[PDB]
Structure formats: C-alpha cells, structure tokens
Amino acid sequence: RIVGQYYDDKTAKLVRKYGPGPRIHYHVGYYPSSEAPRHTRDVTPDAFRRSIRLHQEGLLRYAAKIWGAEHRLSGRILDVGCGLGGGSLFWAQEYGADVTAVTNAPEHAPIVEGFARECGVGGRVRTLVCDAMHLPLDGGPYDAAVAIESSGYFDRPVWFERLAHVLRPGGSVCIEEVFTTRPHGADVWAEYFYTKPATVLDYAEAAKAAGFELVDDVDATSETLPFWEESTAWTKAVLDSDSTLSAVDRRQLRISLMANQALGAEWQAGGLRLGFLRFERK
Amino acid sequence: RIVGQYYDDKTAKLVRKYGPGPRIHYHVGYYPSSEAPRHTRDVTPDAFRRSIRLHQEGLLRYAAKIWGAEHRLSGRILDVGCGLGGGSLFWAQEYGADVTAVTNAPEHAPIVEGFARECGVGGRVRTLVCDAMHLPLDGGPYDAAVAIESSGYFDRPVWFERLAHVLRPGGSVCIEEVFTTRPHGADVWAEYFYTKPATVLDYAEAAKAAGFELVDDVDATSETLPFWEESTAWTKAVLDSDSTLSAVDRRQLRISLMANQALGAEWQAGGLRLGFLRFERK
Amino acid sequence: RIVGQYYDDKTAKLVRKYGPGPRIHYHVGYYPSSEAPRHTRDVTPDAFRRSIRLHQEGLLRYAAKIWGAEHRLSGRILDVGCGLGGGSLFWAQEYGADVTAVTNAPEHAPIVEGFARECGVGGRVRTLVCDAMHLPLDGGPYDAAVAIESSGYFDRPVWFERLAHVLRPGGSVCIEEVFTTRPHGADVWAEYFYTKPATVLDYAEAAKAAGFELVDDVDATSETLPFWEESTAWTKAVLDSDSTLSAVDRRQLRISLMANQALGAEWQAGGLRLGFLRFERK
Amino acid sequence: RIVGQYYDDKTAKLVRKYGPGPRIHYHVGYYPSSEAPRHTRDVTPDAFRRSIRLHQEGLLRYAAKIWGAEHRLSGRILDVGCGLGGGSLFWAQEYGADVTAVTNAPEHAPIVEGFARECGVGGRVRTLVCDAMHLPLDGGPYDAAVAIESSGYFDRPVWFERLAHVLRPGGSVCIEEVFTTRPHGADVWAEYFYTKPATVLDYAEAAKAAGFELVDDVDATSETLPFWEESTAWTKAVLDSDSTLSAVDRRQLRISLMANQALGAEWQAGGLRLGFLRFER
Amino acid sequence: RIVGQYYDDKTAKLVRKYGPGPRIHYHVGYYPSSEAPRHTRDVTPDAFRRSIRLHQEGLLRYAAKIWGAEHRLSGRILDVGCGLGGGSLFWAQEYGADVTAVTNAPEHAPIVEGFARECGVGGRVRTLVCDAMHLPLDGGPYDAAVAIESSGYFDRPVWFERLAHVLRPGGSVCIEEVFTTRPHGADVWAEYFYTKPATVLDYAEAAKAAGFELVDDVDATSETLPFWEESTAWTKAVLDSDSTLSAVDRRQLRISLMANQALGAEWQAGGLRLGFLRFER
Amino acid sequence: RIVGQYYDDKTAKLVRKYGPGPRIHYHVGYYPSSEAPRHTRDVTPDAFRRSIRLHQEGLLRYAAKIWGAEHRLSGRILDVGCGLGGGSLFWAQEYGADVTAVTNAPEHAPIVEGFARECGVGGRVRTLVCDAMHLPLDGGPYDAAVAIESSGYFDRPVWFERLAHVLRPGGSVCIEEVFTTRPHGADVWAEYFYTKPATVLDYAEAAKAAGFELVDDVDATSETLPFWEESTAWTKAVLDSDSTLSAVDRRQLRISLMANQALGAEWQAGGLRLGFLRFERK
Ligand SMILES: Nc1ncnc2c1ncn2[C@@H]1O[C@H](CSCC[C@H](N)C(=O)O)[C@@H](O)[C@H]1O
Ligand SMILES: Nc1ncnc2c1ncn2[C@@H]1O[C@H](CSCC[C@H](N)C(=O)O)[C@@H](O)[C@H]1O
Ligand SMILES: Nc1ncnc2c1ncn2[C@@H]1O[C@H](CSCC[C@H](N)C(=O)O)[C@@H](O)[C@H]1O
Ligand SMILES: Nc1ncnc2c1ncn2[C@@H]1O[C@H](CSCC[C@H](N)C(=O)O)[C@@H](O)[C@H]1O
Ligand SMILES: Nc1ncnc2c1ncn2[C@@H]1O[C@H](CSCC[C@H](N)C(=O)O)[C@@H](O)[C@H]1O
Ligand SMILES: Nc1ncnc2c1ncn2[C@@H]1O[C@H](CSCC[C@H](N)C(=O)O)[C@@H](O)[C@H]1O
C-alpha cells in the first residue's frame, strides 16, 4: 500500500536510531529479566542506541533458540518484511540460511544487498520488492518463513495460503508479532504503525485453513516492555543534547517521544501481547 | 469417575496441608513479586502452611481484581470444580454471590456446606455432586461461571457448550488454569494430577464454537512459580519435623516432595503457562 | 504386612519391566565399567528392558564371583526375600543349590515354583510365604543364606539371630544391599520403597551379637549407578511410545520416572552405598 | 573532624539499634530477593533489630562472595572506617584474615578491641584511631583494603594515593558505598550523614590517578532498598512500644523516622546507586 | 609423495569401509564413555560401518565443542589433509564456514568437490591438490587451519612456517593426531600408515618457532581406543559374511585385521597419545 | 615406641620425596577419578613429586569438605600424629584453627614450628612430643581432633577414652585411615609401617565405649589407589636418572619400590579399606 512509501521515507530515522553497522534491526528488543538496564555512566543517545541494538539482537537470538533455528532456519527460508536486513543477515550468518528478503519499501532492498555484500553473504541473501500477499516466488519449496513484526501488515487468511504453496510439508512459519488479547487492545500500535493486529486465534484460524498447525505459542509481552523505556530514553537524550536540530526534526522527535509513551502505556495495559508463534505446514 | 475417587482420597492430606476452615483452597498461590518469601526466623510446617494459604487467598483477590468481580461475579454464579469450598465462600462472602459449587468428589460436598453454614452464607452456597459437563441445572440462567484450576479435567468443547446454554448473554466464564504452550509442555502436571491440559488456543477454539468471545488472556506463570518452592519446603519441614508419621504417610509425602520438584522445574521450562482467562457469552 | 501387600500389587509392573521368565530379577543391575550403555541405534522399551535384564544377571554373576558361589552357595541355602525367583533359579541352575526361597508376598510364591518347574529344578527350589525373621524352618541346617536387596525390610538384630540358629558353623550370609554411610543418606530409597536402610556398621554390630564375623565388604555404588540411567530411559521410552496406557498406568510410570531421577541423584550424593557383604557363622 | 565527633555521639543510639552482638554493623542490609520479610505477629523492636542485623550480616557474606574473600580478603587488610568493628570481626573470623581497623571516632576503638578479644581474634585485629587519608604506612604492606559505607567520607584522590603506598601490587580495594547516578541524586543521604557521594566514574578516575584498576562493579540498589523499610519499622516499633522514653529521645527517634522516610524515597528515585566496587593496584 | 599415491590406491577399499555418506571420514572414532557399543544380534558389516561412521562424526562434534567452532572454525579455513572431504563438509554445513580443502591425493579432490555440490555448499568448499608444506598463499589470509589425523605426515617446523604466513594473527590451528609419549611409542602406527609421529612438545616447539602459542591440549586416548574394536569387528564381519570375495581382497582384508589387532594393542600400551591441540598465532 | 625412632630416621627421605616448601604431607593422595594422571611431557622425579604433593593436598581438601571443616575444624583442635606439619598448617591457614600438633618423633616437632613461623601461624600451631595414648593435654576442651593416617599406631579403646576427656560434647574425631575388611587384609601395610590396622567395627566399638557415635563412614579405597602408581613411578624415576646415588641409597630406593608394588597389590586385593570416619562425642 502507502505503507511502502511510509517505510521508504523513514529510512533516514531508522539508520539514525538503529544503525549503523551492517545489521540494523527494526523490531522491539528482548530483555529476559523484564527490566530495562540502568544507564548511569553514559546517558548519551549512543548509549541507549547500543543497548537497543544489543537487545534487538537478543530478540533474534531468543527466537532462534525457541524455534531451534539450527535445523529449522538453516535451510532455504523466506524473510518476509525484512526491514533493512538485520534479521536477514542474522539467519544467513548465524545459521547459514539462504534468504529471500521481501519488502514493499523499494528504497530498502538496495540497502540490504549492500549489507549482505558487506558481510560476505551476498550469494546467500536475495531481495525482492513486492507485496507479500501477491508475491510470485520462484525458488522452489522453501524450508521455512520468518516474519519479525511484519505480519501485522498482511491479510492473514490470504498470506498463509501463499505460504502453503511455497513451503514444503513440515516447514515452519515463525512469527514474532503484536497481537490483541482484548478488542482494541493494540489500537495505539495499530493506528500509529498502519498495522492491523489480530488475536492469536485469528492467526491460527487462517493458518489452519491453509494447512498449518500451531505448535508453539510464547508470551514475550513482559520481556519486551523495557524496549519502550529505552526507545523513549534515547529520543529524550537526542532532544536534550543535540543543538543542531532543526525545528522540524525536533518536532518529529517530540512526536516520536509522545508516541513511545502512549505505546509503552498500551503495552502494559493488558490489551496486547508480544507473541512468538511457530506454525508447521501439514 | 476414577479422578472423582482420587479427589475423595485426598481430603485428609488436603485439609492438613491447606490449613483449616472455613476457606480451604486447592490451587497455586499468587506471589505478585515472583519471589518466594524468605522464612528467616520460623521454618516450621505451620509457617509455610500459613504463607501458602495467604497466597492462595491472594490468587483469588488477584483474580477478583482483573475480572471485575464486583459487577461480574457478584450475582448467580457457577463455581465449577469447587474443591473444599474455598473459592465458593470467597465469592459468596467477599462479593455476595449466590454460588452453586460443582464437584465430582462426593466427600467434599458436605464439607463445603458445613463451612458455608459456619460463615452465615449457607443460603447462598449450595453444592451439586455432578460431572461438570453433564447435569441439567435448574438454577435458572447464570450470570457467570468460575473454574479455578479445575477445567483441566473437562472436555472443553462439551463443557463450553453446556455453559453456553446455562449462561445469560454477556455472562462471563472466568478460568485460572495450567495451559500448554507447546505439545507436552505440562506432562508432569498432567500425569501426576490426572489432568488433560490444553493450549489457550484450544480453549478459545472450543469456546468460540459454543458462542463465547475471549476478552482477557493474562499471564501469571512467574507470579505462581514461588508456590512450588513454598509447597516443597512445607513437605520438607513435615518430613524433617513430624516423627509421628506412618510409613504410608511418610512415603506419600516423600512422593509429593519429588512431584513438587518436577512440577517446579516444569513451571520454568517454558512449555507451561499459568494463565487467567475470561470469556463472554455472545 | 503392609509392604507384603505392596509387593503383591507390584507383580504386573514387575513382570512387564523386568522381562519375562523364567528368571525375573528385582534388584539393581551391575555395570562393571561404571558407564551406562550407549543405545545408539535402538531406543525402544524392549532394548532398555533387555539391557537392564542383562546387567541384573551380571549382578548375580558378579556376586557369585566375589562370594565363591561354587563352594559357598552350592549346597542347601536360604534365598531370603526372593522376589519373582530370579535369584533362586540362578543359584539353583548355575550352582546346583537346593534353594528355599522366602517372601512375604503370597502372589509371588506360585510364580517362582512355576518357573522352577519349567527349568527342571522344581525339586531343588521350594518357596515359603513367611516373614523372614519369624518362621521355624525344618529344612535342617543350612549352608548359606543369600539376601539380594531384601535385607532392608528386616530387623537386622533379630534377623541375624534367626540365621545363627538355622545356619551351620562357617556357613555364609551373603548380602547385597543399599546401606547408609551417614544418617539420612538414603531417605528417597527408604520412603519410596518402604525400606529401613542402615549403615554397614549396624549390620556388623547386629551380626556380631548373633555370632557372625564380617569377612568381606565390597563397594559397588559406582558400578550400579548406570542402572538408574537405564531404568529412567526405559520408563521414558514407555511413556513416549506406548499409547495404549490407561491414565492410571501412565501416572504410575510418570511417578516411577520422577522416583528414578531422585534415586539416581541420591546414588551420587555420597550418603549411600550399594555394597556386597559376606558374614560367616562362628 | 566534626564527623569523628558525630560518630562518637551516636554510639549509644547505635548499639541500641544494631547491637549487641559481638558484631555490630553500621551499613545497610542486603535483601537478595529485593523485598523485606513480611513480619508476622511479632512486630516488636527486637524482631526488627534481629532482621536488620541478619541482612547486615548478609551484605558482608554477599560482598565476600563477589569479591572472593577466600583469597583476596584473607590476608593483612585495612578495614577503613571500621564502625563498631562488625566488618572487622567478620573478616577475622570468617576468612582468617589479619585486620587493621581504621576509624576517626576514638570512642569506637576500645569497643572494637574488646569485641576482638571476646571472639578470640584480638591477636588478629588492631585499631588505628586516625584519619583515613593520613594512614600510618609503618605496619608493612597490606594485602587489601575494604571500605563498607565509609568512603563517602573520604577525599578519594588523596585516599587512593595513600592506598597506593600501603597496598602491595595487585592488592584489592573493596568498596560498598552510596554513589550518585546524576547530580544531587544522594543529597538527603549526603546532608544527613555528612558525606560527599560521587559517581562511580569519579571513583575510577581517582583510583586510576593512583595506579588502581577498576575490575568489578555491581549494582545492589534494589537489594538494599528494603533496609529502609525494616529500619523505618524498627523505629516505629520503638516509639510505639515503650512509654518510658524521655521526650528528648522520643524526638530523636522521631527525627530518625522522618529521615528514614526521606532516605528510602531517595533510594528509589533513580538518582542514587548502592554499589559494590573492586580495584586492583 | 609415495604417500599421495598410497592414498590414491586405497580410495575404493576406503569408500567401502567408511562410505557412502556425502561425508566419508578417515579418522578414528570418539567414544565418549570409552567403550564400544555392545552390538546386538545384528553383527553384519553394515551394522559396524554405521557405528564406525557414527563415532567418526562424533569426533568432529567433540572437536567442535572443545575448539568452540562457533567462532574459531566458522570462517575462511584450511582443511589440511581433507581425506575424502568428510571433515571439510562438516565445517561447511555445521558451522557455516568457507573451507579450502588440501590434499596430495589427486583422485580424492573430485570426490570432495562432487560431495560439496550434493550438499549445496560447493560454493563454500574448494580443493587444493598440493603438498601441505608448500601451500599457495594466494587466496588471502585464513581464519584457522584444521588437521584431523593428517599432521603425522607433515614436517611440523616447515608446515607451521607456512601456516604463519597464511593465517591471520590470533588464527587457530586445530590438530587431532596420534602423538608419541615416549620413543617408539607409535611405531606400529607410524610404519603402517607412513607417518612420523612426534610428541606434543615437538609440536609446540615447531609451532613456537613459527610464532604459534599452544593454548589447548586434550588427551582422548581412552575415548578412541574402542574404534579399534569396532574397526576390527567390521573387518571380521566382512571376511565372515561374504563368500564372493576374491582371494586377493580376502588377503588384503586379513592383513588389515592383523594390523588393527597390532594397532589397538599399541593404543593401550602407554607409548602413544591420541590428542587434540589448538595453537594461536 | 621404637616408631618414634623409625619416624625420626626417615625425616630425610620424607623431605626428599614429599617436600619442599612449608607443607610436607605424609599420607596417601586422593584422586577423585580413581585414575592416576598420565605423565608424558615430564617424567622426572620432580613431576611425580609435585603430582603426589598436589593430590596429597587433595586428600585434605576432600576431608575438610566431607567433614565440613568450616565449622567443625576451625576451632581449637588436636592434630594427632602430625607428621611434618602439612595437615597442621592446612587447618591453621585454610580454616583458621588453633592446632596442637602431637608426635612421638621429636626430630619432627622443631620442623613443624619452623614451618608454622614460616607461614605466620606460629601463634596458632603448637607441637608437643609424647605418646598419643598417655599425653597430658593442657589446653582446655578441644572442639575436635584429626588423625590423618596415624590412628593405626594407637590403642583404639584407650585413645578414644583419652579424647573423651579433652573433647567437648558434640566435638568431632575425624579419622583417615587404612582399615581391614577381611582379616590379614592389610598385613603388607601393617608389617611394613609398624601399624596395627583394625576394622571399622573395632574403631566404632572402642569409640562407643568412650562415648562417641559414628556419624560418617566413607570408602576412599578406589580414589587413593592411584597414589601407589605415582609413588612407585617417582621411586623408579629417581633410580633411573640420578647417578649420584650411593649403593646404600640406591638399595633403600629399590626396597621402597619393592614395597610400593606389594602395597599397591594389597590395596586392590579387596582386603583393606581407605576410610574417612567421623565420630561425635556424646
Ligand atoms: N504489504 C507488505 N508486503 C511486504 N512487506 C511489507 C508489507 N508491509 C510492510 N512490509 C515490511 O515489513 C517490515 C516491517 S518492520 C521490519 C521487520 C524486520 N524483519 C526486522 O525486525 O528487522 C518492513 O520491512 C516493511 O517494509
Ligand atoms: N469431572 C469433573 N466434574 C466436576 N468437577 C470436577 C471434575 N473433575 C474434577 N473436578 C473438581 O475440580 C476440582 C479440582 S482442584 C479444586 C479447585 C477449587 N476451585 C480450589 O481452587 O480450591 C475439585 O473440586 C475436583 O473435585
Ligand atoms: N518381611 C519380609 N519377610 C520376607 N521377605 C520380605 C519381607 N519384606 C520384603 N520381602 C521380600 O524381599 C524382596 C524384595 S526385592 C526382591 C529381591 C530378589 N532377591 C531379587 O533381587 O530379584 C521381595 O521378595 C519381598 O517380597
Ligand atoms: N575521615 C575519616 N577517617 C577514618 N574513618 C572515618 C572517617 N570518616 C568517617 N569514618 C568512619 O567510617 C565509618 C562509617 S559507617 C561504619 C562502616 C562500617 N564498616 C560498618 O559497616 O559498620 C565510621 O566508623 C566512621 O567513624
Ligand atoms: N604431504 C601431504 N600434503 C597434503 N596432504 C597430505 C599429505 N600427506 C598426507 N596428506 C593427506 O592427509 C589426509 C590424512 S587421513 C585423512 C584425514 C581427514 N581429515 C579425515 O579425517 O577424514 C589424507 O587426505 C592424505 O592424503
Ligand atoms: N604412638 C604415637 N603417638 C603419637 N604420634 C605417633 C605415634 N605413633 C606414630 N605417630 C605419628 O603419626 C604420624 C604418622 S604419618 C603422619 C600423618 C600426618 N598427619 C600427615 O598426613 O601429613 C607420624 O607423625 C608419627 O610420628
């Protein structure tokens, strides 16, 4: 949709906040203690940035553990909604996977190829720019598909049909996602990020219809709540310190801070769930 | 029922361990800090008994909070799988509910009424020896059903259907239960307690087919883990201190001790969720 | 006897787990390398059953070696606490002994004679339902008594006195047993098996007061530890593979699994010795 | 200075609260689960003092764990700001260390010595009534120096210079202290106890300039916050229980309660950090 | 030399014993409990080959554990004396490494390449038909070099010199080998397999003179002694089972049995050590 | 007896073999794996010496663990049969004990005071030269007594009476010792070292008579067997390498080697037991 233009235009802010390096993640970070680190020695934007980065990697490491990526994500896999390729390179390098990276933000694909060349995995990571519900996917059967915080953009009934045609029997669909637990329980997240979160039931119903079984359903809501404290704290540090900010840039950072507070309030209100689902194709 | 007789044989040990009347609870306790109490001066059996009982009440006090017991559990309710009446009297005394307590252990029904009479609520607490998913009940339409750690013995598709007919529109089904998060994630729990734990997804599927919306899905695994520490230390204390135990009782307590360690381990292993659900009748 | 009835109720599970006749053993197996067998290709229940049985025979073959069974256990012997006859037939068949097998489980006496008859040794193996430390036995003086993992149920001061009268000068008492090495070092063993383990010192004191010299005190704790690995893996295999198990049997097997881990832990903790003793009558 | 006299004056009000032991401790307690014990039906002053003393002892056990006192704190050590000798005796008895206990409260020195004898380690524990930033180096090189809640009273640069000359190479300097995490973050603590708390960076800079390497930094703010609830409860239990309290001591106790209430609020406000540090020479 | 031709000749007798996989291994097996599996009622040649292949694979899993192949063996590495490529493929597949596989048996090079494709790592595994002590350094610096049972064929000083120029600083050199523990301790092994086994000290001296630091030394003699019992059993199972064996191959098999019997006796005589070593540049 | 003159005269050989340093032990070493280390890089006498020394320290560390020396051996204790003070300094320094070191070899006491001064524990370690069964012991009640491989020289009935007068109630007697398990089962050890080993029963009988209870009985026979391989190997290395040996010194080393082989053969023949006993005064 317009979401590809919305993801295009914030390329600059993502590299500012979640860069640099070759692996830039754009998803919430995982704090296995449900507590944000205390930042004392160093309260500059770069301190929160590196802490956000490290715990965003912690999210991937945690997922590969509970999903047993050693055998389930080491083969030929789809990285649906790849962002800037942080996840894509993570599977390619940590588990040797051959990755097809999918995005509807064209500005992003060349960045992912750059970063893959960079780490030397350009022969095992490929991008393609299309909608993930209409994608023609040459590349034979894939052993798995991973969606880190992108399935909220998808039509789930139709998306799971798509994956049923391109995933071999017994292949996995691994989803990290914001879900509702009550109705409207993720509205702040939904309206601000142009997503349409549903319940875990909705995902399971749509996946069952296309021939997938739910084999794992993990609640990481409490372990990802600290991400909003760090995300907020970073935004405050930039506003507080950098005096080269134009009035326009300063207002976007302000709007980002205002949103991070309302998102963090929602996260703990009990109406949403940060989940890790894994489906197996029947 | 084999398990109905299993519950009858438990009464004496249930009464000794979960303390005297009038409210005797047979569920896990709720430790809001996810820390076990440090019993530093007094490590007697009665000291762990009291702490276990205090937090078993806390479970109910907590559940009353998240479920809005003041309007949702203050009317004509079903208390399904009622144990020795602890939850029955709680709802009847703390929220004025008219409680119909259901159980398949005949030995327990007179116990509960003898305790309801003692508390001056004998006219608003009656029992029904019963299979939860079978009887007609001519108690007119019901405002709510509560099931605290009993629904694991039930055929959830059939049980929700029963409830659909006896519950009024918008009436609630409130569940505290051990669910699986992946297949086999509660095998110790299942085989030791004759229980058939299922995933929260299955509960939602079964309740939907019967006409119920899931409107709340709270986690409390880490807040109930300290209960296994406390229950293990009670059993250790009794084995260490009580020298008037028959070899038969001592063996049961040694067995209970082994079970409590396996259960506490399983609580931590990730395959298991202690959650609170609330459904609403369409 | 409460424990006599406990042994009667065990027969079916004893027969299933410790393999079919004619020699059915109910003691720990003896692994001379203190290593458990690596079952690399076949991890079926029957594969662990066979290995357990092979090493249960090895226990007897080992004990025959260290005890000089050729001259010491080839005559008129008592086999006290005889189980299902495994040891009885071993001594009768491998060393030509005339065996009087003693037990307090009435269900087991016909089992043993049906197996002695099948092996053509029915005239040199008779049973005696009995308390070990009570009956008169008019089997004339005896050359030896053997007690393989049964003496833990006995009053050792009284039991050695009985034996002193029915044994001839220089006759041997051969014991394999779980002893304590410090108080409480075998509490799991004791409470789960209704047993009263004592230190080797107590056995020596009791046997001295009755007229017996201790002439051999062998350790075999580390050589019998692998048995708990094997017994645990058998139980795991049955739970994993056998889908026709009643909830009752499944629960017993889940309980046995928990017990086997606690026992294997206790075997390693230092409070416990699996030893072989030989006494000689003065 | 006036501080050494300030410690002299509160000797009796401090043996009442934290005594009698032979080990009296004057530092916060360590609650490993980060919550105070629920106190049963005994809510008397002695019930709370016993709990306070318990977790005070636990703080030293925990410091001894993370510092590996087995090797690092079992030799010839300085106990810098020994209070009433509770920490000094601890190292002497639990780790077979020889301890030189430094204080600027001359009244406390006899009390530490008397208690060293009654424990039978008087031949392993001597006192030094002096300023910590002017330590007699006659007495040979020391293995380590430990400062439990005393270093907020020190000129850190100067103190670490003194330590650089009395401590062998590789010697450890083990510190438990209230640090700041931001400016004015420990002002209630500072202005009430006459300390100058500084950040962890300040401490590492001063240690560096004297040849010391920061090798360990543990945050124990959460685990010591309940001390203020037990310390507040004890005070309330005293005002509530004994009606044979003079108006003057009843007002001193009251002021301590208001202080404990202000101190515990600042402990959770974010601006402060109860930390454990170790430097190597 | 004559060795490279000696490896060429035994290609068929070695695919028979240790194939077919796509991973064929030519090193002893690792039996972590130090005893061979009791073989049931299936005592056929394939039953033993499967067991031999199992613990051969386990040796590489165990080496990967103690070497931490996650970081050290997951980059651009040399597989020095790659045999039929079983170890090469292992590092490519299990640790996402890029592998240059060196051998002096030219017949083995196609077999390693063919198997690299069939596993889909042919773009991560190239071969080098050359002498290990004359390695082409064009091909950029390597992260590590691994030598599973090949270094007994090497001039260690010269080989480590070559390694010092092709390996980045901090690069690892991971060796599994038969070492001597005393003079003549591996003579059966040496004279049968055309090797010159040396002690661990010899290896560390030669590595040092080329700038390498010995950082790990594990003794696995006990855990690899059962390989000779399984290897002997397999041979017996073949002589016993198939009566359509030519006299010539029946005599070659017989000689291998006498060899395995002499080799396993020397493995327990004390004079030899199956070891795992790691050097850092 | 003459044993003090026998212990005097081998002062030279003990320092040669088990020195130097301040802690020289003269007891068997403890190898927790029951396997002697493989010595390959370095097979000189000094390699075996240091390995013997290290595992002799391992014996003390193991004993303080199973005896909980932190509270049981940190007080005022008797080190009966102190040798050259290795054990004495170990308790004084590792657990802060105040040690009275007893010996009948006067040449040895000044060596122990030297080594105590040396380590700075001269104020907490004192020697006295007398027979351990007639010793006047001023020094109030002692909290414990330790005997590492010396009680074989003592009259056990009489020695335990002595300890009953000087040990406070609840104090420990900690014995490491060679014991017989069969008669004559330690004859090689006994005749060569002028000891009179008895059974564990004999020790318990004598200790019970003077008011002690046996609370711990550990079998370390298998863990100390490797000591004879190292002790032999050292003796061979000295004979093999050192060419400055006189014919007399070379014959004593030969005689020592011949004895170490016969002692090592006895150790595994099953007739002796290397034990760690702990008695508590009633
Ligand atoms: N309809 C659609 N089809 C394909 N990709 C879409 C899409 N809508 C949104 N996306 C992509 O989904 C991603 C959401 S955030 C990126 C997630 C990334 N895997 C990470 O965690 O690092 C963006 O890359 C966005 O471009
Ligand atoms: N099939 C069935 N039908 C109705 N009740 C059942 C049942 N199977 C088990 N139960 C009941 O469910 C309860 C299990 S635990 C007791 C729960 C109680 N609400 C408490 O927390 O104190 C017992 O009352 C048991 O008798
Ligand atoms: N009081 C008693 N008198 C006689 N036998 C007893 C007894 N108590 C228990 N036993 C027996 O002791 C045995 C325990 S285990 C079975 C042991 C058997 N020798 C074997 O190893 O196969 C059982 O036969 C049990 O019936
Ligand atoms: N300038 C100074 N020189 C030496 N000691 C000082 C000092 N200023 C304060 N102190 C001492 O440092 C201690 C602070 S509080 C006491 C801490 C003690 N280790 C305990 O935990 O119990 C007091 O003994 C105080 O007298
Ligand atoms: N001089 C030399 N240069 C390079 N490779 C050599 C060599 N001499 C022997 N080799 C090779 O080293 C290997 C020895 S055995 C094969 C080892 C292999 N890593 C495996 O475990 O399967 C053979 O491939 C042999 O051809
Ligand atoms: N009758 C006796 N009275 C006191 N000591 C004796 C004795 N007979 C032998 N000893 C002493 O007992 C010791 C035996 S060996 C020394 C053991 C020492 N604790 C160690 O393990 O390091 C010698 O010191 C010897 O002199």
DSSP, residue by residue, B156-201:
HHHHHHHHHHHEEEEEEEEEEEEEESSTTTTHHHHHHHT----BHH
Q: What is the DSSP string of A206-264?
A: HHHHTTEEEEEEEE-HHHHTHHHHHHHHHHHHHHHH-----HHHHHHHHHHHHHHHHHH
Classify residue A36: in a domain, yes or no. Answer: yes
On whether the CB atoms of residues A233 and A253 are closer than 8 A, the answer is: no
User: Which is nearest to D148 in space by CA: D167, D181, D173?
Assistant: D173
Q: Locate tokens 């203690």: which residue?
A: A33
On whether the CB atoms of residues F18 and F48 are closer than 8 A, the answer is: no
Q: State which H helix or E strand residue C235 sits in.
A: helix C226-241
On whether the CB atoms of residues C63 and C276 are closer than 8 A, the answer is: yes
Using only C-alpha atoms, chain E has a radius of gyration, in whole angstroms, of: 18
Q: What is the DSSP letter of C199?
A: B
Is there a cis peptide before residue E226, judged by omega within 30 degrees of 0? no
Determine the residue of chain F that is closest to D121 in CA distance. F96
Of F183, F216, F273, the CB nearest to C181: F216
- Kindly report the CA angle at C128 between C124 and C131, in degrees rounded to 5? 145
CA dihedral B129, B131, B136, B140 (to 10 degrees): 70
CA dihedral A124, A129, A133, A135 (to 10 degrees): -70
Please give the Cα distance from D209 to A127 (Å, whole number).
54
Which SS3 state, helix, strand or coil, does residue B102 take?
A: strand
Which SS3 state, helix, strand or coil, does residue E102 take?
A: strand
Which ligand gives the minimal distance to the CA of C11?
Answer: 3
Q: What is the DSSP letter of D35?
A: S
| CB-count burial class (<10 Å; 0-12, 13-18, 19+) for F132 | buried
Please give the Cα distance from F81 to F103 (Å, whole number).
5
- Beta-bridge partners for C126: C100
**What is the CA A85 to chain-centroid distance, rounded?**
10
The pairing of strands E125-129 and E167-180 is unpaired
Beta strand residue intervals within chain D, DSSP E: 76-80, 98-103, 125-129, 142-148, 167-180, 213-219, 272-280
Classify residue A274: in a domain, yes or no. Answer: yes
Phi and psi angles of residue C17, each rounded to the nearest 5 degrees, phi first: -80, -40
Q: Which residues contact F181 (CB under 8 A, 6 or more apart)?
A: C214, C216, C217, F199, F270, F271, F272, F273
The CATH number covering residue A164 comes to 3.40.50.150
- Beta-bridge partners for A126: A100
How many angstroms separate the CA of residue E263 from the nearest CA in chain F? 20
User: How long, in residues, is chain B?
Assistant: 282
On whether the CB atoms of residues F194 and F3 are closer than 8 A, the answer is: yes
Alpha helices in chain F (DSSP H): 3-9, 11-18, 45-66, 69-72, 86-94, 109-119, 156-166, 187-193, 200-209, 221-224, 226-241, 247-268
Which SS3 state, helix, strand or coil, does residue F11 take?
A: helix
Classify residue E196: in a domain, yes or no. Answer: yes
Helices B45-67 and B226-241, interaxial angle, to 10°?
160
- Beta-bridge partners for D77: D99, D144
Please give the Cα distance from F114 to F122 (Å, whole number).
8
Q: Which residues of C touch B (CB under 8 A)?
A: 2, 187-188, 191-192, 194, 239, 247-248, 250-251, 253-255, 258-259, 261-262
On whether the CB atoms of residues B151 and B79 are closer than 8 A, the answer is: no
F94 contacts on D by Cβ (under 8 Å): 96
Of B181, B200, B218, the CB nearest to A216: B181
Which SS3 state, helix, strand or coil, does residue A279 take?
A: strand
Indicate the number of domains in chain F.
1
Classify residue B2: in a domain, yes or no. Answer: no
CB of F87 shorter than 6 A to ligand 6: yes
The pairing of strands B272-281 and B212-219 is antiparallel
Please give the Cα distance from A94 to A81 (Å, whole number).
19
B abuts A (3+ Cβ pairs < 8 Å): yes
Classify residue E82: in a domain, yes or no. Answer: yes
Q: Which amino acid is at C259?
A: A
Please give the Cα distance from E183 to E193 (Å, whole number).
17
On whether the CB atoms of residues C217 and C277 are closer than 8 A, the answer is: yes
The alpha carbon of D36 and the centre of ligand 5 are apart by a number of angstroms equal to 66
Whole-Å CA distances, C147 to C59, C63, C81, C91, C163: 13, 11, 6, 12, 12
Please give the Cα distance from B105 to B10 (Å, whole number).
10
Domain range for E82: 8-225+259-280
On whether the CB atoms of residues F31 and F25 are closer than 8 A, the answer is: no
Classify residue F218: in a domain, yes or no. Answer: yes
CB of A26 shorter than 6 A to ligand 1: yes
b/e D193-213 (16+ beta carbons within 10 angstroms → b): bebebbbbeebbebbeebbbe
- Beta-bridge partners for B174: B146, B278
Residue of E153, E224, E274 to test ligand 5 pocket, by largest number of atoms within 8 Å of CB:
E153
Which SS3 state, helix, strand or coil, does residue B219 take?
A: strand
On whether the CB atoms of residues B83 and B103 are closer than 8 A, the answer is: yes
Q: C281 is written with which tokens?
A: 């009558």
Subunit partners of chain D (3 or more CB pairs within 8 A):
A, B, F
User: How long, in residues, is chain E?
Assistant: 281
C abuts E (3+ Cβ pairs < 8 Å): yes
Please give the Cα distance from A37 to A218 (Å, whole number).
23
Classify residue E112: in a domain, yes or no. Answer: yes
Report the atom number in ligand 4 closest to the C-alpha of D26: 22
Give the D:F interface size as CB pairs under 8 Å: 6
CA dihedral B148, B154, B157, B160 (to 10 degrees): -40
Subunit partners of chain E (3 or more CB pairs within 8 A):
A, C, F
Please give the Cα distance from E197 to E152 (Å, whole number).
5
**Taking CB atoms and an 8 Å limit, are D93 and F96 in contact across chains?**
yes
Dihedral sign of CA atoms B80, B85, B86, B87 in order: positive
Q: CB under 6 Å to ligand 3: residues?
A: C 1, 3, 7, 25-27, 81-83, 86-87, 102-105, 130-132, 148-150, 153
Q: Which residues contact E280 (CB under 8 A, 6 or more apart)?
A: E170, E171, E172, E173, E212, E213, E215
The pairing of strands E98-103 and E76-80 is parallel
Q: What is the DSSP letter of B68?
A: T
Classify residue F3: in a domain, yes or no. Answer: no
Which SS3 state, helix, strand or coil, does residue B63 take?
A: helix
Resolution to 1 decimal place, in Å:
2.6
Q: D147 is written with which tokens?
A: 């400062």
**Taking CB atoms and an 8 Å limit, are B35 and D40 in contact across chains?**
no
- Beta-bridge partners for C79: C101, C146
Please give the Cα distance from B55 to B30 (Å, whole number).
5
CB atoms under 10 Å from CB of A220, counted, come to 21
The pairing of strands E272-280 and E213-219 is antiparallel
Please give the Cα distance from B54 to B37 (Å, whole number).
11
**What is the CA D30 to chain-centroid distance, rounded?**
12
The alpha carbon of C274 and the centre of ligand 3 are apart by a number of angstroms equal to 17
